Write an enzyme that holds these catalytic residues in place. Structure first.
Site, PDB file in Angstrom:
ATOM      1  N   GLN A   1      -4.877   3.563  18.431  1.00 19.34           N
ATOM      2  CA  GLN A   1      -5.989   3.434  17.471  1.00 19.34           C
ATOM      3  C   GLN A   1      -6.898   2.311  17.941  1.00 19.34           C
ATOM      4  O   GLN A   1      -6.378   1.244  18.329  1.00 19.34           O
ATOM      5  CB  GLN A   1      -5.445   3.192  16.069  1.00 19.34           C
TER       6      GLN A   1
ATOM      7  N   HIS B   1      -7.317   6.347  10.228  1.00 16.40           N
ATOM      8  CA  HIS B   1      -6.210   5.595   9.598  1.00 16.40           C
ATOM      9  C   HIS B   1      -6.777   4.797   8.430  1.00 16.40           C
ATOM     10  O   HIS B   1      -7.299   3.678   8.584  1.00 16.40           O
ATOM     11  CB  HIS B   1      -5.490   4.718  10.625  1.00 16.40           C
TER      12      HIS B   1
ATOM     13  N   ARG C   1       3.374   6.907  11.628  1.00 12.18           N
ATOM     14  CA  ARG C   1       2.726   6.467  12.878  1.00 12.18           C
ATOM     15  C   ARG C   1       2.522   7.648  13.789  1.00 12.18           C
ATOM     16  O   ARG C   1       3.362   8.556  13.886  1.00 12.18           O
ATOM     17  CB  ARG C   1       3.552   5.389  13.577  1.00 12.18           C
TER      18      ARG C   1
ATOM     19  N   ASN D   1       0.854  -1.207   0.000  1.00 13.40           N
ATOM     20  CA  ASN D   1       0.000   0.000   0.000  1.00 13.40           C
ATOM     21  C   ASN D   1       0.880   1.243   0.000  1.00 13.40           C
ATOM     22  O   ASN D   1       0.387   2.308   0.264  1.00 13.40           O
ATOM     23  CB  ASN D   1      -0.997   0.007   1.146  1.00 13.40           C
TER      24      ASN D   1
HETATM   25  N1  LIG Z   1      -0.750   5.423   6.836  1.00 12.45           N
HETATM   26  C1  LIG Z   1      -0.740   4.194   6.371  1.00 12.45           C
HETATM   27  O1  LIG Z   1      -1.768   3.596   6.026  1.00 12.45           O
HETATM   28  C2  LIG Z   1       0.590   3.491   6.233  1.00 12.45           C
HETATM   29  C3  LIG Z   1       0.698   2.313   5.423  1.00 12.45           C
HETATM   30  C4  LIG Z   1       1.940   1.812   5.128  1.00 12.45           C
HETATM   31  C5  LIG Z   1       3.017   2.170   5.923  1.00 12.45           C
HETATM   32  N2  LIG Z   1       2.893   3.170   6.859  1.00 12.45           N
HETATM   33  C6  LIG Z   1       4.018   3.512   7.767  1.00 12.45           C
HETATM   34  O2  LIG Z   1       5.055   3.943   6.966  1.00 12.45           O
HETATM   35  C7  LIG Z   1       6.273   3.315   7.360  1.00 12.45           C
HETATM   36  C8  LIG Z   1       7.272   3.286   6.242  1.00 12.45           C
HETATM   37  O3  LIG Z   1       6.805   2.482   5.136  1.00 12.45           O
HETATM   38  P1  LIG Z   1       7.769   2.119   3.935  1.00 12.45           P
HETATM   39  O4  LIG Z   1       7.028   1.147   3.091  1.00 12.45           O
HETATM   40  O5  LIG Z   1       8.282   3.371   3.322  1.00 12.45           O
HETATM   41  O6  LIG Z   1       9.000   1.438   4.717  1.00 12.45           O
HETATM   42  P2  LIG Z   1      10.481   1.128   4.236  1.00 12.45           P
HETATM   43  O7  LIG Z   1      11.057   0.168   5.224  1.00 12.45           O
HETATM   44  O8  LIG Z   1      10.574   0.888   2.781  1.00 12.45           O
HETATM   45  O9  LIG Z   1      11.170   2.535   4.458  1.00 12.45           O
HETATM   46  C9  LIG Z   1      11.267   3.160   5.757  1.00 12.45           C
HETATM   47  C10 LIG Z   1      12.552   3.954   5.799  1.00 12.45           C
HETATM   48  O10 LIG Z   1      12.612   4.652   7.055  1.00 12.45           O
HETATM   49  C11 LIG Z   1      13.979   4.801   7.385  1.00 12.45           C
HETATM   50  N3  LIG Z   1      14.139   5.279   8.760  1.00 12.45           N
HETATM   51  C12 LIG Z   1      14.100   4.555   9.927  1.00 12.45           C
HETATM   52  N4  LIG Z   1      14.334   5.293  10.973  1.00 12.45           N
HETATM   53  C13 LIG Z   1      14.565   6.558  10.470  1.00 12.45           C
HETATM   54  C14 LIG Z   1      14.891   7.773  11.087  1.00 12.45           C
HETATM   55  N5  LIG Z   1      15.065   7.884  12.405  1.00 12.45           N
HETATM   56  N6  LIG Z   1      15.013   8.863  10.286  1.00 12.45           N
HETATM   57  C15 LIG Z   1      14.849   8.704   8.959  1.00 12.45           C
HETATM   58  N7  LIG Z   1      14.579   7.602   8.272  1.00 12.45           N
HETATM   59  C16 LIG Z   1      14.473   6.556   9.096  1.00 12.45           C
HETATM   60  C17 LIG Z   1      14.549   3.440   7.080  1.00 12.45           C
HETATM   61  O11 LIG Z   1      15.956   3.447   6.982  1.00 12.45           O
HETATM   62  C18 LIG Z   1      13.861   3.152   5.731  1.00 12.45           C
HETATM   63  O12 LIG Z   1      14.612   3.504   4.583  1.00 12.45           O
HETATM   64  C19 LIG Z   1       5.835   1.920   7.828  1.00 12.45           C
HETATM   65  O13 LIG Z   1       6.820   1.363   8.682  1.00 12.45           O
HETATM   66  C20 LIG Z   1       4.526   2.272   8.540  1.00 12.45           C
HETATM   67  O14 LIG Z   1       4.793   2.654   9.890  1.00 12.45           O
HETATM   68  C21 LIG Z   1       1.702   3.846   6.968  1.00 12.45           C
END
Ligand SMILES: NC(=O)c1ccc[n+]([C@@H]2O[C@H](COP(=O)([O-])OP(=O)(O)OC[C@H]3O[C@@H](n4cnc5c(N)ncnc54)[C@H](O)[C@@H]3O)[C@@H](O)[C@H]2O)c1
Ligand SMILES: NC(=O)c1ccc[n+]([C@@H]2O[C@H](COP(=O)([O-])OP(=O)(O)OC[C@H]3O[C@@H](n4cnc5c(N)ncnc54)[C@H](O)[C@@H]3O)[C@@H](O)[C@H]2O)c1
Lengths: 373, 375
Positions: free
Chosen positions: A293, A317, A264, A125
């Site tokens: 949530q 959400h 989050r 997603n």
């Molecule tokens: N709102 C929604 O419906 C929804 C849905 C999908 C994911 N998400 C959230 O989004 C997050 C990220 O998703 P993604 O697919 O991009 O994940 P991903 O693992 O591809 O990318 C996340 C990135 O965050 C980086 N990161 C970690 N800690 C960090 C910090 N302190 N500063 C900067 N970068 C940092 C990691 O190195 C990584 O490259 C998920 O873990 C989830 O919590 C939200």
């Protein structure tokens, strides 16, 4: 290879009420059960599904004690606390129907029943969310919410809402995290002729992707925030990002800046975001994520506004559970389940968060003792 | 050497900024700030009268237009230059739009008024602003933002209720009616979203080079395009052939559950037909910023019409072209057009001219014979 037999699956999903009967595309609901019921039952597995996950003596709390597989969904998260994991005597596999497994105590999971597998549907997603970020940036920058309210109330005053209406062209946008979502946010922003596109991540983009998208890595988070008109948070929730966006860090953002958070809820300190809006340090906050949530009915970010009575683009959400997204994460949950139930344990490595007692990802903080399989 | 024109009466019809225009000087396009023109005109010996009073019988606009030599209007609060008013505008030589879209002037009547008046606008000044507003509005409708935000502010929480009408823009077909400065910029911003296809309908096509760069396809027939699209966006001017174009019959060619965006002009749609299509679920959404007339009456049906799920309305006041970034550019452009006239050079940018010397000076207000492009 011998398939596992008579496996108890517990799914904690949101209640779709009449909506899930009327719109079968709501797969991620207690009504539709991710389209899994017949597929599990035909193999001799059992499925128990509930939305009752928060109260003392919840259905979740009773059923988790002998579930072998627990399916959760971030939109209505069954929090797998250390206390609950200690009672989950049969648990081997925790599958997130979605992305983001921070509603599991992953440190506790690594010490539970020999180290449980925590898996999620990586990439399912990420487009949905990136679209939602760009939407929310534009809604905030262009002052949509109070303008739409003015129309529905029967009023008409262009200056009242144009006075806080900007263009995104010429603005600097920074992403915290340039993974699957953050990269896709920058790829959608490219066409808007922002002055600059910035990112902060300890896992950088390749030089080729930097040039293709047209973005720049900033090595220090506070230095990035001081340069941005818009900040978007796209990193997972882990110990080092919990409460990261507190009053001190928000104070590094520009006065009148716009903050988006589809990552989050707990990455921000809600009272500090509300105070920054109240005093005009932020012009806007928006996104779809909350802690906990369901968001409590009195959560301050439901109603917090800037000093002009705008600046709030919060939603439930939902971005990751668009109808298009649900088809993809429902299919991915089936694939992860089949990896386990077949006895092959042939998971996509990118789906694994913890496995065999170790973190299986680089994305939940910079760690020693990470085992990528 | 060319002799400058002397003691020219300028009339500006702009929106009332009230306290907002005192507190936010960037509201240039208001009766308070007068597009930053007053000192610049007065230092040349010209006079400036500015008003927001433009609709009532015996309005300030109606009194002052009878001897104004230059009339500055703005589409956000349009002084309608009807044939009746133009017939009373005995001194009028130049009508300048502070913004883009001069359809609040009767252009046919302007061509027959005082030997053919010049109608000019600030071409390109807010086309980015509008294109951004279109993409925003498409996303708000497709992702069901409005009822979701309402749920939150009301203290409620029900993911299914609003996710049941939430889609992604990825994999959808988007069509633009018009591929001029705004429509082309809309497609340039949609490119990154991986739409299934980007389509356009315009009698002035893109170059093959631009079609391949953006990744879009010209559809020769409007009804053919509408039947293929999940999203339609209207980005053409208001003229005889586009007034009431989006009526019940044309909206019926759109897909059931499609999303319609209109940042062009209100009168291009038939408001009762849009409301009916939304109310029956033929449209999932309508949004945009433009209305007919303006100000929009308090009971205008598109303020409150909804789809059968209680969403699908992303209307705002007429604001996209009057963002603070836009206002800086169209204020500067009005000064440039005024200087072309007042200097006696009449050295207008050809692209700013709508009618000039008794003829249409643009191809964009319908396919015409007797168009005279200067140059
Ligand atoms: N709102 C929604 O419906 C929804 C849905 C999908 C994911 N998400 C959230 O989004 C997050 C990220 O998703 P993604 O697919 O991009 O994940 P991903 O693992 O591809 O990318 C996340 C990135 O965050 C980086 N990161 C970690 N800690 C960090 C910090 N302190 N500063 C900067 N970068 C940092 C990691 O190195 C990584 O490259 C998920 O873990 C989830 O919590 C939200
Ligand atoms: N909402 C706002 O604030 C705002 C601001 C600026 C402009 N506008 C409106 O948007 C319009 C377009 O502005 P632009 O800068 O893109 O103008 P433009 O002249 O560059 O492009 C308009 C295009 O529409 C085409 N067109 C005319 N009739 C058509 C028809 N029947 N079907 C399809 N295409 C047709 C023309 O051929 C032309 O290429 C303006 O005329 C104005 O009415 C709205």
């Amino acid at each position: 290879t011998a398939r596992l037999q008579m496996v108890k699956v517990l799914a904690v999903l949101y209640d779709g009420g009449e909506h899930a009967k009327q719109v079968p595309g709501l797969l991620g609901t207690t009504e539709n059960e991710l389209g899994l019921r017949k597929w599990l039952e035909d193999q001799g597995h059992t499925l128990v599904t509930t939305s009752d996950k928060d109260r003392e003596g919840s259905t979740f709390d009773r059923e988790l004690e002998d579930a072998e597989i627990i399916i959760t969904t971030p939109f209505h998260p069954g929090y797998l606390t250390a206390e609950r994991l200690a009672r989950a005597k049969k648990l081997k596999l925790a599958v997130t129907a979605g992305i983001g497994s921070d509603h599991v105590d992953l440190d506790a999971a690594n010490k539970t029943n020999g180290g449980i597998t925590v898996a999620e549907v990586t990439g399912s997603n990420v487009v949905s969310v990136a679209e939602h970020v760009v939407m929310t940036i534009l809604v905030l920058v262009r002052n949509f919410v109070p303008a739409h309210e003015q129309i529905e109330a029967g009023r008409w005053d262009v200056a009242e809402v144009a006075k806080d209406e900007y263009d995104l062209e010429g603005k600097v946008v920074g992403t915290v995290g340039v993974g699957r979502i953050g990269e896709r946010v920058l790829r959608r922003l490219k066409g808007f002729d922002c002055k600059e596109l910035l990112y902060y991540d300890y896992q950088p983009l390749s030089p080729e992707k930097e040039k293709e998208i047209g973005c720049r890595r900033v090595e220090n988070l506070e230095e990035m925030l001081a340069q941005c008109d818009v900040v978007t948070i796209n990193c997972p929730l882990h110990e080092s990002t919990r409460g990261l966006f507190n009053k001190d860090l928000i104070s590094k953002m520009k006065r009148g800046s716009w903050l988006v958070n589809t990552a989050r809820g707990a990455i921000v300190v809600k009272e500090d975001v509300a105070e920054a809006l109240r005093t005009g340090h932020l012009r806007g906050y928006g996104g779809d994520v909350w802690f906990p949530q369901p968001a409590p009915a009195d959560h301050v970010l439901r109603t917090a506004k800037n000093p002009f009575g705008g600046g709030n683009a919060m939603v439930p959400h939902m971005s990751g559970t668009s109808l298009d997204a649900q088809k993809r994460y429902a299919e991915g949950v089936k694939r992860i389940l089949d990896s386990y139930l077949s006895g092959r344990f042939d998971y996509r490595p990118e789906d694994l968060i913890v496995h065999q007692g170790k973190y299986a990802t680089r994305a939940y903080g910079q760690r020693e003792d990470v085992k990528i399989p």
